[PDB]
Amino acid sequence: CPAPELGGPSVFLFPPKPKDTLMISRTPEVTCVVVDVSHECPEVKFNWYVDGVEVHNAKTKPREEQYNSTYRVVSVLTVLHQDWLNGKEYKCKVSNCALPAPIEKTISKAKGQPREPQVYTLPPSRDELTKNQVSLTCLVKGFYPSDIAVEWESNGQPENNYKTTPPVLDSDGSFFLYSKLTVDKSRWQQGNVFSCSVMHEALHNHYTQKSLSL
C-alpha cells in the first residue's frame, strides 16, 4: 500500500504498566514508538534522559513493516520502580534524516499525593440469580493516580473470566473503576470464596484483597 509523507515521522511515548512499577520482581518499561519512518531514511537514532541525564541501557527492536509502506521503530528503556514512582521525567530524543530537528517527547507519572483505593466487593443482584452465570462486582474508588491493576481469584488460582472498566475521574479528582467477575451460578451458591486483588502505589506492600462469597 503506497502512503508516503514528509517534518518526517511521528513519535509516541508510553509509560510502564501499573503492575510492573508496583512489584520489584517485574520489569517496568518506558516505550518510544516511531511511525512514518520512510525507506529513503529507515535507520532511527534514540537518545534517552532521566531528569535531563542521558542513560544508555535502551534496546531498539527490529523494524516492523506497516500496511501503508512505512516502518515502525520501537526503543525500550527499562526503568527503576522508585524513579518512576518518585516522578522522574523520561525523555526520548528521536533523530532520523527526515527530521531537520530531533523530536523530543517527555512522560512521567501523574503528579500529586497518592490516595489509597477503597475496595468493596458486591454480590450479584437477586434478579441475576435466574441466569446460569452471575456477576461478582469489585468497586475500587478514592485512588490517585489512575494507575492500578485489578485481578480475581478463588482457592489461590487466577479466575480468567473478568473484565475491568478503565479508571473514571470522580468529582473529588480521585478515580474509581469496577471489575466484573463472571462465574457459573452453581460455583456461587456452592459458596466458593472469590478474591478481588488490587495493586496500587498508595497501598501497604502495594496490594490489598477483598474476599466475596455466599
Ligand X SMILES: *[C@@H]1O[C@H](CO[C@@H]2O[C@@H](C)[C@@H](O)[C@@H](O)[C@@H]2O)[C@@H](O[C@@H]2O[C@H](CO)[C@@H](O[C@@H]3O[C@H](CO[C@H]4O[C@H](CO)[C@@H](O)[C@H](O)[C@@H]4O[C@@H]4O[C@H](CO)[C@@H](O[C@@H]5O[C@H](CO)[C@H](O)[C@H](O)[C@H]5O)[C@H](O)[C@H]4NC(C)=O)[C@@H](O)[C@H](O[C@H]4O[C@H](CO)[C@@H](O)[C@H](O)[C@@H]4O[C@@H]4O[C@H](CO)[C@@H](O)[C@H](O)[C@H]4NC(C)=O)[C@@H]3O)[C@H](O)[C@H]2NC(C)=O)[C@H](O)[C@H]1NC(C)=O
97 Cβ contact list (under 8 Å, min separation 6):
8, 41, 43
State the number of binding residues for ligand X (CB under 6 A): 20
Residues 23, 29, 197, 210: which binds ligand X (CB under 6 A)? Answer: 29
4: its cell numbers = 508516503
Q: Which of 89, 104, 170, 184 binds a copy of itself (CB under 8 A)?
A: 170
DSSP label at residue 145: S
| List 41, 98, 122, 202, residue binding a copy of itself (CB under 8 A) | 122
> Closest Cα to residue 195, out of 145, 166, 157, 169?
157
The answer for residues whose C-beta is within 8 angstroms of residue 100's C-beta and 6 or more apart is none
* Residue span 63-82 as binding mask against a copy of itself, x where in contact by CB under 8 A, dash where not: -----x--------------
- Listed ranges 71-79, 144-152, 166-174, 186-194: which one lies at the site for a copy of itself (CB under 8 A): 166-174
Q: How far apart are CA 15 and CA 90, in angstroms?
A: 9
| 196: alpha, beta or left? (left if phi > 0; alpha if psi -120 to 50) | beta
Which stretch in 31-39, 86-94, 95-103, 134-142 sits in contact with a copy of itself by CB under 8 A? 134-142
Which of a copy of itself, ligand X, none sits in contact with 66, Cβ below 5 to 8 A by type?
ligand X
DSSP letter at 165?
P
Between 94 and 212, CB nearer to ligand X: 94
Smallest separation, CB 179 to a copy of itself (Å): 9
Closer residue to ligand X (CB): 66 or 213: 66
Q: Among a copy of itself, ligand X, none, what does residue 141 contact (CB within 5–8 Å per kind)?
A: a copy of itself
Applying CB under 6 A, does 72 fall inside the site for ligand X? Answer: yes
- Residue 1 Cα to chain centre, angstroms: 32
Residue 101 neighbours by CB under 8 Å, 6+ apart: none
Closest CA to 175 of 147, 146, 150: 146
Closest approach, Cβ 29 to a copy of itself, in A, equals 26
CA angle (15, 176, 120) in 5-degree steps: 125
120 binds a copy of itself (CB under 8 A): yes
Residue 143 to residue 200: CA distance in whole angstroms? 8
In the list 38, 135, 146, 213, the residue contacting a copy of itself (rule: CB under 8 A) is 135
Q: Applying CB under 8 A, which residues contact a copy of itself?
A: 1-4, 68, 118, 120-125, 127-128, 131, 135, 137, 139, 141, 161, 163-166, 168-171, 176-178, 180, 182, 210
